[PDB]
Structure formats: structure tokens, C-alpha cells
Design a binder for this molecule. Structure first.
Ligand SMILES: *SC1=NC(C)(C)N(O)C1(C)C
Ligand SMILES: [Cl-]
Ligand SMILES: [Cl-]
Ligand SMILES: [Cl-]
Ligand SMILES: [Cl-]
Ligand SMILES: [K+]
Length: 164
């Protein structure tokens, strides 16, 4: 397991534009295209992202290219955020992946607002952090995925992913 395999588990792979768990147009491995309800707007974002006139359909290689960029962007967002970087730097590599996963799903600003959970993670109070992380819209709307991410923070293991 690693962050790529982890997010690939959590996000799936679909080569045609689809709506994500929030109803937003998405493609590939959880590549968010737009929050606009306009499919035409989403297709325009897709063509811009890929660099060609797509029919709303991409290849697996193209999906993986966007995925690598999105994982990189999530790490970059963590490292340039004054709230997320200290927590990231304090974590082991398995729990770092859990934080990248959250930023991939909800964005840097959203995760940076989890002030009390972040403090408990920085303090390495793992069970308390896990309890606090579940008191969230995130957990309520995507509880199975949030449970996997939270178990990863709680244990520092891949137990929630290695037997999927
Ligand atoms: S989890 C997971 N990742 C891949 C895509 C390799 N899978 O088939 C699972 C087991 C759903
Ligand atoms: Cl089209
Ligand atoms: Cl330490
Ligand atoms: Cl709490
Ligand atoms: Cl709550
Ligand atoms: K998805």
C-alpha cells in the first residue's frame, strides 16, 4: 500500500464523466472537474485538463496522468499551508498518506479548518483524534471512506486497506 493505491481504492476509476458523491462532475480517479451543474462546463474543464477535444471520455493513461498531478497538488497544498505543514511534518509516512487522502477529497482549505483534529494528531493522541475526526460532515456523508482514513490515523497501519 501507498498513497496512490490508497486513493485508487477510495476513488475508483471511471473513464467517462460521472458525478461524484457530492453530485459534481468528475472523471478518472476522482478528478473533480467543476462544481458547476453544466455538463458543457465540465467537458470544457476536461478538454483543458487533457489538452485535446475529448468526447467526455479519456483513456486509462490519461486518467492516471491527472491522478498523479492531483496527488502532487494535494502534497503541495499541504506543504504550503501554515496549518497543515506542521502536522504533516510531524507524522509517519502512513499517517501522512491519510492526510493527503483528506486533502485530495476535500481540499487544502477544508482540511486546514479541522483545527482541533489537527492538534490531536500533532499531539499523537490517536484515539482522541479518531473520535474527533468522526464528528464531521465528512464522516457523515462518506462514513465508510472516512472510517478507513480514520483507522489509518488511529493505527498508523494499512489495516483498513490491505484486505479490500
Ligand atoms: S482497494 C482496490 N484497489 C484496486 C483497484 C486494485 N482494487 O481492485 C480494489 C481491491 C478495489
Ligand atoms: Cl462530446
Ligand atoms: Cl514526535
Ligand atoms: Cl472530540
Ligand atoms: Cl457532528
Ligand atoms: K470517485
Amino acid at each position: 500500500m501507498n498513497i496512490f493505491e490508497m486513493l485508487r481504492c477510495d476513488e475508483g476509476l471511471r473513464l467517462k464523466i460521472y458525478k461524484d458523491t457530492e453530485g459534481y462532475y468528475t472523471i478518472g480517479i476522482g478528478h473533480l472537474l467543476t462544481k458547476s451543474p453544466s455538463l458543457n462546463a465540465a467537458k470544457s474543464e476536461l478538454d483543458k485538463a487533457i489538452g485535446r477535444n475529448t468526447n467526455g471520455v479519456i483513456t486509462k493513461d490519461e486518467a492516471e496522468k491527472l491522478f498523479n498531478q492531483d496527488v502532487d497538488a494535494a502534497v503541495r497544498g499541504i506543504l504550503r499551508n501554515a496549518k497543515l505543514k506542521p502536522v504533516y511534518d510531524s507524522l509517519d509516512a502512513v499517517r501522512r498518506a491519510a492526510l493527503i487522502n483528506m486533502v485530495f477529497q476535500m481540499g487544502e482549505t477544508g482540511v486546514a479548518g479541522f483545527t482541533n483534529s489537527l492538534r490531536m494528531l500533532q499531539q499523537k493522541r490517536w484515539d482522541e483524534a479518531a473520535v474527533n475526526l468522526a464528528k464531521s460532515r465528512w464522516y457523515n456523508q462518506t462514513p465508510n471512506r472516512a472510517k478507513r482514513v480514520i483507522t489509518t490515523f488511529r493505527t498508523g497501519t494499512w489495516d483498513a486497506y490491505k484486505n479490500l
